Amino acid sequence: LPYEEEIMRNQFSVKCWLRYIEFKQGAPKPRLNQLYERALKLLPCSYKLWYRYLKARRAQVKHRCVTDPAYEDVNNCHERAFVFMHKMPRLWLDYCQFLMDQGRVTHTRRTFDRALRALPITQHSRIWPLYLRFLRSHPLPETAVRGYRRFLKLSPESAEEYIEYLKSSDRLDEAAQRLATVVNDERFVSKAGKSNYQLWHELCDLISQNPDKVQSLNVDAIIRGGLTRFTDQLGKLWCSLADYYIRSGHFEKARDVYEEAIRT
Amino acid sequence: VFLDPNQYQQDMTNTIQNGAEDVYETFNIIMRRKPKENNFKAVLETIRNLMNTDCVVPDWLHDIILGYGDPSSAHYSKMPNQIATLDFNDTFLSIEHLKASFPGHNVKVTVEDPALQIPPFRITFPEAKTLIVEPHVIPNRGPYPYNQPKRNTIQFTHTQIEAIRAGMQPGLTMVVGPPGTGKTDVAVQIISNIYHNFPEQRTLIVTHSNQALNQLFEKIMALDIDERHLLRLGHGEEELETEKDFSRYGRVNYVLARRIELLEEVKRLQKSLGVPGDASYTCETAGYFFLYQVMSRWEEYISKVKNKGSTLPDVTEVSTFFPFHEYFANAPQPIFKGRSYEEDMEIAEGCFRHIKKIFTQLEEFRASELLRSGLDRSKYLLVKEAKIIAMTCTHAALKRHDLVKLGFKYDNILMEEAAQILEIETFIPLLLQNPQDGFSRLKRWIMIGDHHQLPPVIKNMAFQKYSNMEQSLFTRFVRVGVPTVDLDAQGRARASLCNLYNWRYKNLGNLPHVQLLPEFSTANAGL
Amino acid sequence: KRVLYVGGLEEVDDKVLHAAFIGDITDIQIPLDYETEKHRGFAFVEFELAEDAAAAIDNMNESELFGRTISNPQVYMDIKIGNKPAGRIQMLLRSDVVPMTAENFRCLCTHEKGFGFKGSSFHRIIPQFMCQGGDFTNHNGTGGKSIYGKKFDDENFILKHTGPGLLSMANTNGSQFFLTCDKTDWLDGKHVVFGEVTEGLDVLRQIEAQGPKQKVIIADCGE
Amino acid sequence: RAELMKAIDFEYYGYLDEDDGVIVPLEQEYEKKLRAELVEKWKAEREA
């Protein structure tokens, strides 16, 4: 141990530091964190030592409950890691996982936005589905509409999860505009093999069952556009148009939609 | 050419059924018109877009615009989320002016020492007339001599200060200023108080005539408002302003030059602190350079000084342990005069606050760095960065399609000379944005004008006589019965001149501190 | 499986390639747009699932831990016929048969002796018989110098020029080396065969088709 | 394709969600309830 401490003071590479921490791997936690701070003050921007530091810190800090000065030290060394390892997405994923462990919402959104700032365009795919999990873990949709708007701005072939989120978190009007603007596009992959009929039927059923939420779009124009789009499966869309008139309270209009449903 | 589509569809359904001659196949004269009057199609497109979007007008302005129900429900005294805490930098020149300019209100000053009773003030607004006023101090802006510009020196009247008090609160308010009262100073004090209380809020300022818009825009440079949040799109930009600019590219290049200068200051601080690295820093690397080298050095600095310690730290300890002595060599030496420990700590906190101002300005410029194209940078300037946006009614009706194309949002709306601004010219800049997800961003709607003043420039006598289309929205909101703030004391004209037209206004009095000047004490020579 | 297949990053360098991977022990970028980074440890070698599409001098470099981007030394010489490249002859010089001539060809490609095939031309090329070059002194097969002097003996003639891309030490073997594109058993016993191009056999066939009517010179070469 | 996927990116870095001022107090209001539930959630597993 004194010769090992002298060798660790005389050497500089990451393997001697890792061997010294593996030698002193007991529970020296305050002196261990002091030796971590001294070793990273001598050697900055070393990914292996920084990842081992944050992994050992997050493994050892678990006795604290929710809000502790130990957790504030964990957060402060997380941005001290992010000074140089901002381009590394794994430490960003570790801090966001620890932020769902802690329970912060707006600071987790701020650090996800800072991760989107830090990773230029290439490594956003390693951090974006964890942000979708973050927005699905919170039932309030006011942040999640703009977050999934940013995800559709980045990757447009993901609107089906947004439609499922808005049909699970009752933003039915915005679900209707998003469904109507994804089903009429030419190139879109729903990753389920819908063949552009199940999306039309889901849009028609969602705008049929709940017409009071949908107060901006033209329901009849959208469903007649779908009816002119198809030639083989018109009956479900005709039932959906008259069922829109049923939930709108227009029984005579539903009878008339059935009348040219017969006629056309 | 883009032809009229509805008229074209009418021509095709006319010429194939009734057998009439085709309109668009026999044209022989092309007609062009002058600019600034060729924008009526943009006005009609703005009206058609506002008709097509269903719920642009909020519910708290719906019954006020339509005039139904109680006409005094637009007043600030009937609203449950009324703002209590308000900051006033240069509205009040003295504590006795603050006492004399609040009629019907008791002033509870939190301090008893008149030496600390100085502007700026913070007033908490509602026994029921108690105003909890504390005179606070400005933060130290650094060791630079020229870091504080000229503030307001106009001593407003109690009605003019009550106009600002109604203008700070959300809702509809009006400033009825007769010619003589000087409503321009009240307008720029409203703008300065909005910018100082809520710097994240965005203010739209609309004036119809470009000369009066330039006159309102010139006074902002003589206030405590930074010029990087200003924007004025339009063809009436031609004023006497020295740095020119004030456009979409014209403030984005100023943002880039300020970012270059602050990154040069960051490089100078890096060479002062001896951090390794000679290449130029980005805004992200500047923020992480702050959070690693400036924040940690300030942490060990305040730990070694021990401000939160058992005993009082030494005055010279700040000067010995300050790590930015060689960075501020352009400042007049010494940085710390050594008179007192808390004064030296105030100078050190001013240096750190100027450093944090530079670093948070670079954090704001980080998003301008993140966008590649200058169109995206101008969009960022138009939506997020610029907090003061100066329009005319005609240019707002021109660019209302482009503002909703670029996602323009605001917080407060001001129209100056609301009798010179027409009623549709009042309604058009009211609705430049649209509500998204059931949320309206509109809080304040301030009409600064005079319903006894002129109707605007209408070139037909019959429309402005018979149809009453020259009646402004200001005059209509007076004539329904909304309570108005009629300014009383006039501060640029002679009292015998004011006595000739004071009968048109509700108690148009005279301000005595202007009338005791030697120009108003004497009369006209030779008469 | 510690080596990567990082592509999409000629303007890059070894320090710029290893700065993102630093504890990379080996970093050998190919003459094309490909590089391989290998870490000595086990936790540090998982860079493909950790720093994929990393920015390398304002350019994304996707990293995959495989050998898709690509003992006897291989003289990899981009033999250019005239001003255009005729192919990268990666002639695997047979050190098992003739190790001295194979090391001479590898050193002439790597240009570690001050002169060699990196920049020299083949002035003795025959149609499907021999293509002799590597002489950096007289540039005609009448100059050249080996490691032992101006002239050196052949190592061993165990290998034979039995197909395309077979390399031999031309002459007695100094810096002259001959690539064969067909059977050359009549010249066996005088020129010791010291190579077989498993890669760049098409480059050897193009050099034999061009051979001299054109200046067939390997300006870029290495091991 | 980095150039094709950087065709347009506005409000992507979280700079326009805080301009409206409607989600900033609400995220903290839900955060207070979430952390208050997590205090008793960890307290239910401390002695177990």
XYZ file of C-alpha atoms in Angstrom, chain C residues 93 98-106 155 169 173 192 194:
15
model
C 5.441 -11.642 -50.582
C 12.141 -16.787 -49.929
C 12.262 -14.658 -46.749
C 15.162 -12.394 -47.792
C 13.548 -11.485 -51.129
C 10.123 -11.170 -49.466
C 11.567 -8.802 -46.844
C 13.347 -6.890 -49.631
C 10.035 -6.474 -51.497
C 8.226 -5.476 -48.276
C 17.088 -16.809 -50.895
C 13.052 -11.439 -57.254
C 18.694 -10.411 -56.801
C 13.447 -17.005 -57.095
C 8.892 -14.760 -53.561
